[PDB]
């Protein structure tokens, strides 16, 4: 089997991408944030504290003839941005882009933190990291991909995120028309539960490539590119007037600037992030200070190849017995 679904930016900045997901019978379609940095499929629901729902579409398990309470199971998750959610668990039929999993754990939120409530466009998350990170207790549950894997034509999924445009998540096949050149594969460590890999270096604009190992995670659920402070300083030094602002929370730059590209290495291959992809717009409405899309990972404890980096590539998440990642230009 295969599946293929379009993923759509939630706003004009590509802050996140939403993908429609069918849950239950008859289907209830919710728009979920596919997150290769976590491993829970959780949704706003009829159980979510009413004051914490503000415009989201909810899953109502009592209206699904295939829903079953997973007795005794609870979940609770906290994300790298400080947000969180928790609740109980149902199993139900879940379909993505025509690919169907029966008995998928659907984690129903009883509580969500304010950042989720305040974002009416995201109805929940669909985790695509390794199932070892799933938070369901006392019986850990499998991700949608883990449940589907054995049925897929090939045990892979691909992320093809658009810049200021929709893109595609495919399951079970490589669309060889979706990228240019070849796909370069690179080793993955699953020891922290992430799609963790080592970039071979970077370049700023037309500058020379610096060969240096940068361990980080491929994380579709993180907006920005978080890299070591040395690398980030080298990038922003090429933007007149850019500076790190402790009050804003990162590097800002004059909105009048033209940003240089940023290149990262995948083995001997190179992925080029155009400068425009690094502009996240005014820090507040009407400001001439703009927020940068490359930020320091100091204090996060891990480097994160978030959407800024991934949307410059066609990315293969190869879930074979020994997982690997692939990157191609597009």
From Swiss-Prot:
GO biological process: proteolysis
Disulfide bonds: 255-290
Active-site annotation: 35, 199
Keyword list, A-Z: Aspartyl protease, Disulfide bond, Hydrolase, Protease, Signal, Zymogen
Top-level taxon: Eukaryota
Catalysis: reaction(s): Hydrolysis of proteins with specificity similar to that of pepsin A, prefers hydrophobic residues at P1 and P1', but does not cleave 14-Ala-|-Leu-15 in the B chain of insulin or Z-Glu-Tyr. Clots milk
E.C. number: 3.4.23.22
rRNA processing as UniProt keyword: no
GO molecular function: aspartic-type endopeptidase activity
All residue ranges annotated as the Peptidase A1 domain in the record: 17-328
Membership in a protein family: Belongs to the peptidase A1 family.
Protein name as annotated: Endothiapepsin
Organism encoding this protein: Cryphonectria parasitica (Chestnut blight fungus)
Residues of the full protein shown: 90 to 419 of 419
